[PDB]
């Protein structure tokens, strides 16, 4: 996260840290005691599927304070439409091997209904993005969880306000733009898969997943987030299904 602040410990309790062989991979969002939402692209280069760990209640990576809860990732479910090495349909649903225990420091974010998300949440201007990602473009990652407030843009307005670069990926209906074009504030490498959380009438909801951008906080560019509302029905159906053998599962989308 570039240009944000430290999320006070316990104020981002749905934040997930994903690890591979104990090393920082990506972020995620807890949506109930067993299920985590992350980005499909985080799994493009995984070979050691058995060494994938999700950590809940994490805050400071330098110390163990006892609020952390680690779980093996039993399954990673990706839409059939996602293509490795690309940006479209950038979502993954992760089943934990054992549920996390809900506490003051481990709480799920609400996965909203599709109509509520499209008709109401999509018009809430500011939302929070968080992670232990790079603090600067080509910079060091954070030891404490960071959070940033970002405004959402209509895709026409994002394309109008953005500088042309060439060979740049298109903004599809499965994405949205959020952030600032003045090079001060953005999500960054390592924040991928983390939450874009929206407040509405005293409750927080999952509206986006940190996905991509053309460098962190690049002047003339905004952050790109997976538009979660497109996937509500897809996620709900998978969560009502029995686990299948094998860590990686490709599920038909729609």
């Amino acid at each position: 996260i570039v240009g944000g602040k430290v999320c006070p410990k316990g104020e981002c309790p749905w934040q997930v840290l994903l690890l591979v062989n104990g090393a920082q991979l990506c972020g995620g969002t807890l949506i109930n005691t067993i299920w985590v939402v992350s980005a499909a692209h985080c799994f493009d280069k995984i070979k050691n599927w058995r060494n994938l760990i999700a950590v809940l209640g994490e805050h400071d990576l330098s110390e163990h304070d006892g609020d952390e809860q680690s779980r093996r990732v039993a399954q990673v479910i990706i839409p059939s439409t996602y293509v490795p090495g690309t940006t479209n349909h950038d979502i993954a649903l992760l089943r934990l091997h054992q549920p996390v225990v809900l506490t003051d420091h481990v709480v799920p974010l609400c996965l909203p209904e599709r109509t509520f998300s499209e008709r109401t949440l999509a018009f809430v201007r500011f939302s929070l993005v968080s992670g232990w990602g790079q603090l600067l473009d080509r910079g060091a990652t954070a030891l404490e969880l960071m959070v940033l407030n970002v405004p959402r843009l209509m895709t026409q307005d994002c394309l109008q306000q953005s500088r042309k670069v060439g060979d740049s990926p298109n903004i599809t209906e499965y994405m949205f733009c959020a952030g600032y074009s003045d090079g001060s504030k953005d999500s960054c490498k390592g924040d991928s898969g983390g939450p874009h959380a929206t407040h509405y009438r005293g409750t927080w909801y999952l509206t986006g997943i940190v996905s991509w951008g053309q460098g962190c906080a690049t002047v003339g560019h905004f952050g790109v987030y997976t538009r979660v509302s497109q996937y509500i029905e897809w996620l709900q159906k998978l969560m009502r299904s029995e686990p299948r053998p094998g860590v990686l599962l490709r599920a038909p989308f729609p």
């Binding site: 309790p13 003051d104 709480v107 974010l109 005293g202 927080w204």
Partner: protein, 55 residues
């Protein structure tokens, strides 16, 4: 009705035949007798921050 200001619902809204609207809540919440508000039924409902709720 649900299209305009979430039909007055705190959480989810369902449109019905005629001038009928039913508000609903996410799991871990119940609808109040006002028919719009949602109250937690569990200790750790989704989307609430305990350290902020407790103070």
């Amino acid at each position: 009705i649900c299209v305009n200001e979430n039909g007055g619902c705190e959480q989810y809204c369902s449109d019905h035949t005629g001038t009928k609207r039913s508000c609903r809540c996410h799991e871990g919440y119940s609808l109040l007798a006002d028919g719009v508000s949602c109250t937690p039924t569990v200790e750790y409902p989704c989307g609430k921050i305990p350290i902020l709720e407790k103070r």
